Amino acid sequence: IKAYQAELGYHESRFSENLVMLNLVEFPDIKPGDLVELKTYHKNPSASNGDKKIYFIAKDFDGETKRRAKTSNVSILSGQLQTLLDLPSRSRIWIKLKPNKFDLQADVVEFNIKDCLLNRGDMWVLSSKLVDTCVFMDQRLAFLDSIRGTIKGIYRNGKKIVSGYIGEQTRIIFRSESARLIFLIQITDEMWNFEETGEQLFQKMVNSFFPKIFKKWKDVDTHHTITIAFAISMDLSDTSFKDLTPGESLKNSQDYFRIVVDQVSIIHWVDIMETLREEFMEIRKDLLNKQTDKGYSVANGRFSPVIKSNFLELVNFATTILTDPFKQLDLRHTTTHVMIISPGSGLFDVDYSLLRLTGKKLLSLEMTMDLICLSKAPLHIVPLFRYRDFENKLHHCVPLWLSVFFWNEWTPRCKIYDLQMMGITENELIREVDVEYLQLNKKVKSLSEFMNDYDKNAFEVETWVDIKSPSIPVSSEFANELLPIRWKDVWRSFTTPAELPITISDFPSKDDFDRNFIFRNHSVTLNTDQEQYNQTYKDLLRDMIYMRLLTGFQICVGRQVEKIELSRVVNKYLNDAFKLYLMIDSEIHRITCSSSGIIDVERYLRLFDQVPSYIPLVKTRYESSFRDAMIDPLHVKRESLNWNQIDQVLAGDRKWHGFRAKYVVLPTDIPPNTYSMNPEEIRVEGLRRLIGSITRSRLRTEKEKKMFYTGPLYNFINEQQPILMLSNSLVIDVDPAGKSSKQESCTVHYDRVHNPDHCFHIRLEWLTTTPKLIDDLVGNWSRLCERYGLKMIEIPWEELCTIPSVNPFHSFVEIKLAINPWEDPEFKDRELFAKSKFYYHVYLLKASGFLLDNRASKFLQNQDIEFDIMYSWGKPQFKYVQYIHHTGAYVAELRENGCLFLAPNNIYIKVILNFKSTCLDYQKLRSIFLDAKEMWIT
Amino acid sequence: GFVPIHTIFYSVFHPTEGSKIKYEFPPNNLKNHGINFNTFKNYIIPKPILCHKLITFKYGTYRIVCYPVTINSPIYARNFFSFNFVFVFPYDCETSPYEPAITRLGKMFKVLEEQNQLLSKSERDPVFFDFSIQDLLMRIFQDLNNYSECLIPIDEGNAVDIKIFPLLRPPTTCVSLEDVPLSSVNLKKIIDVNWDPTMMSIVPYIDGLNSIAKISKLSNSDPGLVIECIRHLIYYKCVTLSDIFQFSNIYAPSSLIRNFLTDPLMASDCQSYVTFPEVSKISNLPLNKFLPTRSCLFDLYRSLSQGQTLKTWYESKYMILKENNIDIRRFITFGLEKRIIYRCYSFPVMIMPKLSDEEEGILEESIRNAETFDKICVLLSKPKLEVESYLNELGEFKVINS
Amino acid sequence: VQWSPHPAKPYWIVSTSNQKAIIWNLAKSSSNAIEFVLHGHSRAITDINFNPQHPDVLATCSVDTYVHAWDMRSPHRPFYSTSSWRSAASQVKWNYKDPNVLASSHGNDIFVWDLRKGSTPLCSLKGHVSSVNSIDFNRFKYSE
Incomplete structure (x- = not known):
């Protein structure tokens, strides 16, 4: 293959949309759409x-490019590629054509995702759009003209290339720098244990790890x-740690959990470090000072060791x-990465059945537990688990x-605490067992024979x-195993964690497939109601694969x-043959079309x-006392989804729900330009405009x-006076511009009736x-509401009393009001109550600014009529009377005994402490x- | 053990008058001792290349240890903020145990200044921009001079936790398979949950007469990890290496044999050590078929000689040990432990079943490296006579008992 | 270091050896004069004092923010434990009159402990600006 010398030329984006363009007239030997190497070289480095x-793709010029450019052989779009090339105009470069593409497929193409949510199915679709496309380093790609992405690494044959x-077998890896990260600090007896250099390990954690990260x-x-x-385990026995069997x-x-920082953006790192340091300084008083019923507190309790x-x-x-999987969506963050900070060295004594359950749970969900140890690397292979x-x-x-x-x-890699700390007094560790007394054999009758038998067996x-x-x-091969x-197809994990890879190159063997497996078969077909819309079998098929990638399936190729x-033929992306293989730890799916x-x-x-x-004891961010947890952490698990009904509803309903998010719009301040167009009149005009904008979608x-x-x-029900629906049904088009190639349909329920003192509810049901x-x-709706003096805010669908039994890290406090109206005689009246x-x-x-949420509540009622009440999304399964803050940052809830609940709105995210006080x-x-x-009275 | 601090002072770079001392405990200690801060002010606040480095320098009879910190941010005046928590020590000491403490103090104050602007706001003067220092310095000074430890809270979540640790010599790499370890302490009672599992396996086999290969085979352990665990126990100054006891060995008195004489409690320990608890059966076996006095033990210690093996020495003096009920292994072990005798190692330098290929390869590698008989016997798991017979089959060799 | 004021035990010396307190027996030989060692706090013991009414009771304070009260009849575990949880202790002193009241100074604060009231202090003297170094009871008044 000869090398083709060529010039260089640039152009603006207003004339072409491609990256590198050639002339097919000037290069008749190069077919269009072929991988063509570009190199400025004179056979020298x-x-x-x-x-x-x-690399690029051979593409011809346009009509305007041919009419304008005459002296430039290669027209390359200006910007990032021009800066990477670092060449002036009309520079002498060379062109080489590679007719083979499968040998030049890159092993790893990285992709960094910022400030947006991209599902694994969306990553699969983006990789399906990246088939037969050449990329370079630090290239800002795009997806539906809103999802940017920087390619920070390209790898081939173990070598990094610009x-x-x-190709099809390119193991493209998507990493997110907008991600939810969980840090579990393992508070044990060794957090205050000194390292051989002379530093306590929590001092390392708060002065060398967190500031650097x-x-x-x-x-x-x-x-x-x-x-x-x-994350605290407390030893309640008086037995010494030296007597514990390995x-x-x-x-x-007793096990404790103190949530220091809740779901908080990392731009508040000063407050995060301050709260972490304050809670770590207060945790000793919180835990080791138990309260006795005799009226005083006894300094009791001991932290468990790291191994136990x-x-x-x-x-x-x-x-x-x-x-x-169908929880609330963090629309700005992608990956859920858990980091465990421990003062040990990877040695843990564990239960066998709990280890099996932990392995089976971790193989069925998208987390990477990145344990970091503040002690030196030990002499054994890490992580090491010992069980009986x-x-x-x-x-x-x-x-x-x-x-x-x-x-x-030399670094001391073995920990001897009693000799480093000199914990044993010199007079009491003097050696007790000595050399033996030279016992005989009962077969030896001479001293020379004894010496010979000792020298023979020495x-x-x-x-x-x-x-x-x-x-x-x-x-070495075992350590490589x-x-x-x-996660076989993957400092970089700490800063930019990776999502679950779209593909896996592993499968059970033939004997294992017939050993512990059962077979279930589906047969799902297009329905005539959905083919009125632009819906063939293909886009429905890739929507099913989108759902499988959302649950956690990986497309097996290998x-x-x-x-x-x-x-x-096995497939990875999307003709009529679409044989895919999707596998999790629970079930394996073979899908053919x-x-x-x-x-x-x-x-x-x-x-x-x-x-x-x-059932451990959990202390959230706003609590002052350790309370019993509302969920069993071991016995909650990723359940096997009822996939038959899923395929039935994607084809076209108890104990089944999709992705869902409740939306609350709230009255706020009116902009001054709106007044030049009653505040209640313009607010109800804005509400009617929002309803019309939804019904026009x-x-x-x-x-x-x-x-x-x-x-x-x-009062309004009996004023205008069996099932009375308080909401309407509507199936909207989310994308009217047609950016995506599939159908984006969502179901909307909005409140039929409205009060200025009652929160207005918008529902979004999407699969x-x-x-x-x-x-x-949602941003467009929020801008439309803010133009008319409202404020659309995002709120949890589930009730506030249910959050600890789902999300244990969320803040949640018990509020017991001091002045009881039903007990204190200062305010007591039969008629008022x-x-x-x-x-x-x-x-x-x-008086504190909390708007009411559940308008259909039966705890603030005066009379009962209309036996059956129902919303368009189902029955209201609310136990207490929920309240929403007017700023929407916090959620309140009023029980039947007068005790309040209180929890912030972490999805959207001073006043909370003011209301608690x-x-x-x-x-x-x-x-x-x-x-x-x-x-x-008045 | 640890040198007391001479003067602690906190120097900051003022944007108007340059580098200056803000607080200093003891008060006016530097001027009373002739230490002028303006002489070395360009080392306390150097250029940012030298900053964030452990700087220690000598000024007269005093050694001055500092960790300069420079933070670059537009919040501060002149686009940077610089401070230094400076420690002064005498010259004729070892400031090595104190250097990580000062380095970590500087790094922690760097973290606090980068986080919440502690030291810059502590000046209470709005010229550095666009909790007591003196009490903290007093507490650090007196706690490190009186306890070698401190816990001084400076905020609601921050405290100065400094403990001064001694510096230990690193273990040697000369430990090998033929060396036997002697535990100088009772290692069973030191075992807590934080010990290494390999070391925990090694502990019930350090009886003072087992080789590292024998301990590795007994504990099902790889010899390299046993070597590293013995090195770690050496690093804590608790295990001393020795030699395999054989009657083919050659022992000779050392230069410290007079310490058996010039010690009030060595000979009594020898009497209580080398004797069997009862009338043992070894004290009834013929050569072929009260406690012993300290003069007898000394005369037995002298009678060892170079080139004379322990078999010949024991068969020349066997009525003495039989009548005095003396264990010869315990006698040799006490002699080696008090450094009054030494072993002359045997070196087979060059000019029966069929031996294996790997066996002959490691035998040739041991011969070509001039290794001792002990190392070859350990590596082949064979006694001395089989190794000697195989070597005589392979060639002619001479033995040096050095 | 602190001499035991018990008339029946004039051979006892309590001395701090970093994180452990060493009781010396002078009737024993100089090679092995240590009788028993109190294994309490994790960091260095700062001050030790004997109860004047009951000379077999010893209170130890340390840098690790703990005040442990020991009994010399059973010198293995302390019979009373309390803490300030914030600042390292500097001294511990007993009351000469009331034989179960002891006070400790932790930085800027002075906490008075009752031996029957657990870790909850009887009072917290908090009038000092800088760090309190020394504390001392009155031999004649109960509460000075």
């Missing part, structure tokens, strides 16, 4: 600019949400928040899902991998899948009762494209839509209740 190998080619986050300009929670966990223990700590309980506490079997047999195993990093000439004598002994090393199979398919439209789906489905119940077929009042609800389109639709049972609590919430002050609550009585 001329410093750094002489070695610049850049430019590469993306925050500096690295700021340097890359990542926008994360950190979540820092303490392999057995602690029989008597509740490590698998901490990992299950971390995996509590990913059990439900049913026959009290010690074993050693290294888990695949845990990766150990160490934070930092020189005599799938979630874990079982290590034979920690004192013998492993081979230690990596998870679901050797074992090919060798097991022929024992009856045809020209008829029928999609054949075969499900190969594959412990929780042999683990004791475990109705998704239409291709065939067709060719009450206000004030007061309680029951397979792109979340960025939902996010920009008969007319309004919760009058004082409602007035207290209203107001509820817990005699003077403020007395003044508020006196004002309430004065308003009641």
